[PDB]
Write a protein that binds this ligand. Structure first.
Ligand SMILES: O=[N+]([O-])c1ccc(O[C@@H]2O[C@H](CO)[C@H](O)[C@H](O)[C@H]2O)cc1
Ligand SMILES: O=[N+]([O-])c1ccc(O[C@@H]2O[C@H](CO)[C@H](O)[C@H](O)[C@H]2O)cc1
Ligand SMILES: [Mg+2]
Ligand SMILES: [Mg+2]
Ligand SMILES: [Mg+2]
Ligand SMILES: [Mg+2]
Ligand SMILES: [Mg+2]
Ligand SMILES: [Mg+2]
Ligand code: NA
Ligand code: NA
Ligand code: NA
Ligand code: NA
Ligand code: NA
Ligand code: NA
Ligand code: NA
Lengths: 1011, 204, 204
């Protein structure tokens, strides 16, 4: 045997790891990166049968196809084809913890393929098969004979089939185990799936071949000169006539070249490597690589006889860059980086863990368009094309070993155990051997959430010895252990310390200066974008810009891991943990992305775009100061557009070319402006626009923006006198006010506005009443469960306090006739089990112009948990197509997540006012609004609001968006005040004190009128 | 102050006065103050104040009311922070309790006179037969702000007739990280744009 | 214990302290202080003076002390507070969170200053929170930071007692005088009164 229950056996007959090969036989095709006739794909239609345990597989399958097998596409994860269920568990392992054993019932995928091999491949050289990703462990047979075995789901397994194959038809048999001892090191927080989920290929190499090659680029002090050093190793027939020529190209121009015979310098008393050769090429004024300008060269490595026969050629894209930590700072090409990063899992809602070029490209475009410059491979080596794309489009990468043992207790139980050193070593070393020549990889990581064990210290040192060009990081065991060159915490807050024993999460600003500490700090995970979140994001960015050693971080995370399911009617819907019968499970914790699984953005993405801008601005008088945060390029594809508007109405605008050097400034003086007609606030908005398309953005792409309030002329102009006075009519149960075509009815038993008529049409489906709660966000719930309440979560604190069930008690309701209006005065108390939680006192003044001015003053008991909101709500009878407001927008914005929003006049379709979070909650709020228009109504004031076809009650009771149903009418929530949403993490309260409603007394006012 | 509105209405059990004023300079409106005074059968006068402050004017030193009371009394008694002078950014040492001091203890004799003697977090203030209730900051003494500002040495101050009372809904921090560059932290500047406060003046 | 050397009014501030011809006079002010006070246990830190920029004479005297008395650290604020003549980062009036990036001698936020690239020393402000008049606004912000950051080890408030002097009026009664009140000019008026206590020891 049971090799899959033995961590001492992680492979049998597997070839050594090495950088990407294609064995070209023509150097120009190697130079151009064209396809090679010696590298074939075996992707396509294969045969597959599912078995409940390896003991159930029939021997016959080795020799021939099973009649009951299906033909399926490979690569794939078998759960995506319905064979068995994917499981969504976060920390707790999906199997009983009893290493190194796995369950007797262990889903086994039997894959097979009959394929052709040309005779020419068998007349010479070696033919190997490569499986880029097999989850979790597998045995391979060729033509009925056993070839070998492999573990590690995330790196390639290569086997020499030379002696097993025959001309023409051949048949592969692959028996894939879902669970193996490798599973104890694969406990990442993601769907647990299995299968042959990365490409399968066949590669022909000559008998005398390039078996490995390492490319290094070293520089002089100002990066005006470099030496490219390429060490090449061969296997096979070593003879004096062999040579290696390494040539370096910048496009179609050859910039350098060197040729040498094999035989490295003397290494020790026994000599040197007669099978290795190191070529050193001098390159003057090299064009440097960065995420800003991903300049690349092409190195071609030719193995050939001295007299001119090319044996084979391999090759790679080279990016000239130096990565080093000096004086506490991580520098790239001598300048300190500011990492605008994101963690990105390999996830597709239809294909599972199978990646494709299109999806990868789509992700890199969106990342770049949203001002990200870096990505962490949470938490494993990625599909090979990912690196190629990050080298070409330009993203800094953290390459991470596939080692995560989160569910152990304590977390380092395996990583501190020498018996697991061998299995861990292969996960680290084979990754470095495969990905060490990609310029996009700038930092190596030892894996994730596996505590800190002595195995990490050994491996940290192994990487530092083999590759001195990149720092090594690892967060386990407290984020600043001896196994990391970078303090790289997860979810450490900006100012707040969380002093957990043994592994405290200090405020990042305090962490940098602890006694004796000198390393740079880059969070490996920060701001958990689960549901309506990212509150407090701007606090991180202000700190990063202020403190040199705070060099950024990687947002958690890029894309929700939701999967598509289909209902009885055949309509697709987004599913999360437990939706496949999987249990135990961790429900919606698999959805923490800035974008939905189909790549549609969540609102939080625009907040990240704005805080991660590369241009900063300051305003002084008529002067705008632009500062560039690029380190290497000048602003050669950018112009500044500016607009001054009065409450939404444009008054003046222009454009100015931007010419700012990296880290430089440009002062721009705006024109003499037209002093405004009417009253209101003037606002200046500026945007940086890229006129020319790029490889990653369209012409006109906006990359940065900022707004400022300019002059304000408060209105002192009196409204005209009205030719009318509203009339009051009273009964024991109501106060009715009439003014022309308008009527208002106040219920004297409840003390609320129960109905309004315009003309003779009823406007309300439910009365206008105070609201102190919200349908809880993922951050309000945290890890709380019905089955296991977490009393410290906001939602539980509100529930326990009775907020959700408190009943309004009427303390007063009066009506008075004024000179030109009717005034209704009310007071209510909300209580629970004898405790008065809130007191609401209001006045409603309806004048002869038909406007109703509502004044609200609320008292909140200092000892009840601060409430989610202080506002009013009602179900309007009308359903209108559009929503138009003067306030922050156009996207959803909350108090602690509104920096990206701009004050202007926005107008959207109603549905755009609802955000379809998979797990429904309060959503769609827009803050800082001065006027709201819907149908015939207009509300004016200074408030926050949401408007949609779904009640807060319905959102709190429904757990999946596809189950919500539009209600009659439109539910309007208009808040004087609304609590922050939080998001530094999604398992402990994270709303900062300044965003909690703790003032005790609150005042707000609204005018509701028609038009 | 330029008057925008002054009306009176009678309600079932009270009289309501409504006023609106604008404060201007060189044709710019700096602040707009809207108030209601509601006088009831109990003799209590409830004052509601809603102020607007133009966004482009420097944030103001305070948002309150003031008057010169005709009489002088021996003690000042309040339910709020104290007993000593305290300001928004310098009130951590003060305690919420019922305090009672002689009127002169309500004036701090800084050699170079200025605004002084405020107490914050006050829910009730008693002076002679008067009582003010709300959630405000106040100072009370024999010297007008005008006098303090015009006088550079404490020995030249003279007690005015009566008692000057400044009652603030909001008051700016005093700063002090240095005394040569603005040092009041943003969180203590009156930059909210719209401010509301309410007070009840009654007799005791 | 601080040597009597302050040349604040020079332009630039280190004009004399960077001049070897002034090394002898400066040296006597440091050496004679150490010879006098080195046996007192209350003295825990020596200081090279105040507001005299940073000149090579400071570096020479810093080493002299280190050599003769290894038992006490040496500090000195001039020249940017973190020069080679100080074992403690000891700025004056650096704020808690806000940087003041003056050219050549910036005053960083203290929290940020601790972590600048390559910095490892403790930080104790030689002067902070200027208690001139109605002041000390934001004092709590410093103490919250000192308790949260191990390397922020406190500071010396500026300052203990107002430097006012007594003058007598026509009637013979005393009053508190400041700059210019003796016919002295030029003068810096009330900037001599920055204490937590009045000159007569009554507290502010
Ligand atoms: O509340 N807990 O006990 C708890 C324990 C472990 C947690 O792990 C956290 O889960 C996150 C869920 O999206 C991510 O997987 C993150 O990597 C991890 O640290 C989060 C919460
Ligand atoms: O504003 N200035 O130009 C200015 C120049 C020098 C200043 O020096 C400051 O004065 C303080 C006044 O009590 C103290 O003497 C302090 O030691 C000194 O740094 C303060 C302000
Ligand atoms: Mg094994
Ligand atoms: Mg050639
Ligand atoms: Mg042949
Ligand atoms: Mg984990
Ligand atoms: Mg569960
Ligand atoms: Mg003078
Ligand atoms: Na930084
Ligand atoms: Na998760
Ligand atoms: Na430009
Ligand atoms: Na819900
Ligand atoms: Na004065
Ligand atoms: Na400390
Ligand atoms: Na002074």
């Amino acid at each position: 045997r049971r090799d899959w229950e033995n961590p001492g056996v992680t492979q049998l007959n597997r070839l050594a790891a090495h950088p990407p090969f294609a064995s070209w036989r023509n150097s120009e095709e190697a130079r151009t990166d064209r396809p090679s006739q010696q590298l074939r794909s075996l992707n396509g239609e294969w045969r597959f049968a599912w078995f409940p345990a390896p003991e159930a597989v029939p021997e016959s399958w080795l020799e021939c196809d099973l009649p009951e097998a299906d033909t399926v596409v490979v690569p794939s994860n078998w759960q995506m084809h319905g064979y068995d269920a994917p499981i969504y568990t976060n920390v707790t392992y999906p199997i009983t913890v009893n290493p190194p054993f796995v369950p007797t019932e262990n889903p086994t995928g039997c894959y097979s393929l009959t394929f052709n091999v040309d005779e020419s491949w068998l007349q010479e050289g070696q033919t190997r098969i490569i499986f880029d990703g097999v989850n979790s462990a597998f045995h391979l047979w060729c033509n009925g004979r056993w070839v070998g075995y492999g573990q590690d789901s995330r790196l390639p397994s290569e086997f020499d089939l030379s002696a097993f194959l025959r001309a023409g038809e051949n048949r592969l048999a692959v028996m894939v185990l879902r669970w193996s001892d490798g599973s104890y090191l694969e406990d990442q927080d993601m769907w647990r799936m299995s299968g042959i989920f990365r490409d399968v290929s066949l590669l022909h190499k000559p008998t005398t071949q390039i078996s490995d090659f390492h490319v290094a680029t070293r520089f002089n002090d100002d990066f005006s000169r470099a030496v490219l050093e390429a060490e090449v190793q061969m296997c096979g027939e070593l003879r004096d006539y062999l040579r290696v020529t390494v040539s370096l190209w910048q496009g179609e121009t050859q910039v350098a070249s060197g040729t040498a015979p094999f035989g490295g310098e003397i290494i020790d008393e026994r000599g040197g490597y007669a099978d290795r050769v190191t070529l050193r090429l001098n390159v003057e004024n090299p064009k440097l690589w960065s995420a800003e300008i991903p300049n690349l060269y092409r190195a071609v490595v030719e193995l050939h006889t001295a007299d001119g026969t090319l044996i084979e050629a391999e090759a790679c894209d080279v990016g000239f860059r130096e990565v080093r930590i000096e004086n506490g700072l991580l520098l790239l090409n001598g300048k300190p980086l500011l990492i605008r990063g994101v963690n990105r899992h390999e996830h597709h809602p239809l294909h599972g863990q199978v990646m494709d070029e299109q999806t990868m490209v789509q992700d890199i475009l969106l990342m770049k368009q949203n001002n990200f410059n870096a990505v962490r491979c949470s938490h494993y080596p990625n599909h090979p094309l990912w690196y190629t794309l990050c080298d070409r489009y330009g993203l800094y990468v953290v390459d991470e070993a596939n080692i995560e043992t989160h569910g152990m207790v304590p977390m380092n139980r395996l990583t501190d155990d020498p018996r697991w050193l061998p299995a861990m070593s292969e996960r680290v070393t084979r990754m470095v051997q495969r990905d060490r020549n990609h310029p996009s990889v700038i930092i190596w990581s030892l894996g994730n959430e596996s505590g800190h064990g002595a195995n990490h210290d050994a491996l940290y040192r192994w990487i530092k010895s083999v590759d001195p060009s990149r720092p090594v990081q690892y967060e386990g065991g407290g984020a600043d252990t001896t196994a990391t060159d970078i303090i790289c915490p997860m979810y450490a807050r900006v100012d707040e310390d969380q002093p957990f024993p043994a592994v405290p999460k200090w405020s990042i600003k305090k962490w940098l200066s602890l006694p004796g500490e000198t390393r740079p700090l880059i969070l490996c995970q920060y701001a958990h974008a689960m549901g309506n979140s990212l509150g407090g994001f701007a606090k991180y960015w202000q700190a990063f810009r202020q403190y040199p050693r705070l060099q950024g971080g990687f947002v958690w995370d890029w894309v929700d891991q939701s999967l598509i399911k289909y209902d009885e009617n055949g309509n697709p819907w987004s599913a999360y943990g437990g939706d496949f019968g999987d249990t135990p499970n961790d429900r919606q914790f698999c959805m923490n992305g800035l974008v939905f699984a189909d790549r549609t953005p969540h609102p939080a993405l625009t907040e990240a775009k704005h805080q991660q801008q590369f241009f900063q601005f300051r305003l002084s008088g008529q002067t705008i100061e632009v500062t560039s945060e690029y380190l290497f390029r000048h602003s050669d594809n950018e112009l500044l557009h500016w607009m001054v508007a009065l409450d939404g109405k444009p008054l003046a605008s222009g454009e100015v070319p931007l010419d700012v050097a990296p880290q430089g400034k440009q002062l721009i003086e705006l024109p003499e402006l037209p002093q405004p007609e009417s009253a209101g606030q003037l606002w200046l908005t500026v945007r940086v626009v890229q006129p020319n398309a790029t490889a990653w953005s369209e012409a006109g792409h906006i990359s940065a923006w900022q707004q400022w309030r300019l002059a304000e002329n408060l209105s002192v102009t009196l409204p005209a006198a009205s030719h009318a006075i509203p009339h009051l009519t009273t009964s024991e149960m109501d106060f009715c006010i009439e003014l022309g075509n308008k009527r208002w009815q106040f219920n004297r038993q409840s003390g609320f506005l129960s109905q309004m008529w315009i003309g003779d049409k009823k406007q309300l489906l439910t009365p206008l009443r105070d609201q102190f709660t919200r349908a809880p966000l993922d951050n309000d719930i945290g890890v709380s469960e019905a089955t296991r309440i977490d009393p410290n979560a906001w939602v539980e604190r509100w529930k326990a306090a009775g907020h959700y069930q408190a009943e309004a008690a009427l303390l007063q309701c009066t009506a008075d006739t004024l000179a030109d209006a009717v005034l209704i005065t009310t007071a209510h108390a909300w209580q629970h089990q004898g405790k008065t939680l809130f007191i609401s006192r209001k006045t409603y003044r309806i004048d002869g112009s038909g406007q109703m001015a509502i004044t609200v003053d609320v008292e909140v008991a200092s000892d009840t948990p601060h409430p989610a909101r202080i506002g009013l709500n009602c179900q309007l009878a009308q359903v209108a197509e559009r929503v138009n407001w003067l306030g922050l927008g156009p996207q959803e914005n909350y108090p602690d997540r509104l920096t990206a929003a701009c004050f202007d006049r926005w107008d959207l379709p109603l549905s755009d006012m609802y955000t379809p979070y998979v797990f429904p909650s309060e959503n769609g709020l827009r803050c800082g609004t001065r006027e709201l228009n819907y149908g015939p109504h207009q509300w004016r004031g200074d408030f926050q609001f949401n408007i949609s076809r779904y009640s807060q009650q319905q959102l709190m009771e429904t757990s999946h968006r596809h189950l919500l149903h539009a209600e009659e009418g439109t539910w309007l929530n208009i808040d004087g005040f609304h609590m922050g949403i939080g998001g530094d993490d999604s398992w402990s309260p994270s709303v900062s004190a300044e965003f909690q409603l703790s003032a005790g007394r609150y005042h707000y006012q609204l005018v509701w009128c028609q038009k």
